[PDB]
Copies of this chain bind each other. A is one copy, B any other.
Amino acid sequence: DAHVLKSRLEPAFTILDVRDRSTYNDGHIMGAMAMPIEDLVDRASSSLEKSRDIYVYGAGDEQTSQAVNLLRSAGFEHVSELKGGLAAWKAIGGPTEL
């Protein structure tokens, strides 16, 4: 129901997993979306607003920074890197799914 949803929803944010889909399938940050870096710009730009709070993580920090930079170069105004990726996330007991 809509009320149900309205309840769950500061501003909207989205978590992007830029690793390969297969890796995503083995496990990812809960709610994160699979957008392999190869098609990141196209998939991100076609589905989100440039003002969306976006949290990104790849297999390493270099891949994470490449992705973050790509998004910004594509007009995204609020992109942040998730240092440590999935590993650091799991270390603070962050929810994951597969």
Contacts and interface: CB of A to CB of B under 8 A. Distances in A.
Contacts of A37: none
Binding site secondary structure of chain A: mixed
Give the number of copies in the complex: 4
Contact of A12 (B31, B43, B91): B31
Interface in A7-38: 7-15, 21, 24-25, 30-31, 33-35
A90 B7 contact: yes
A10 B34 contact: no
A6 B47 contact: no
Chain A: interface size category: 35 or more
Given A2-B82, A9-B31, 12 more contacts: A2-B84, A2-B92, A2-B94, A5-B13, A5-B55, A7-B90, A8-B13, A9-B12, A9-B93, A9-B95, A12-B97, A34-B46
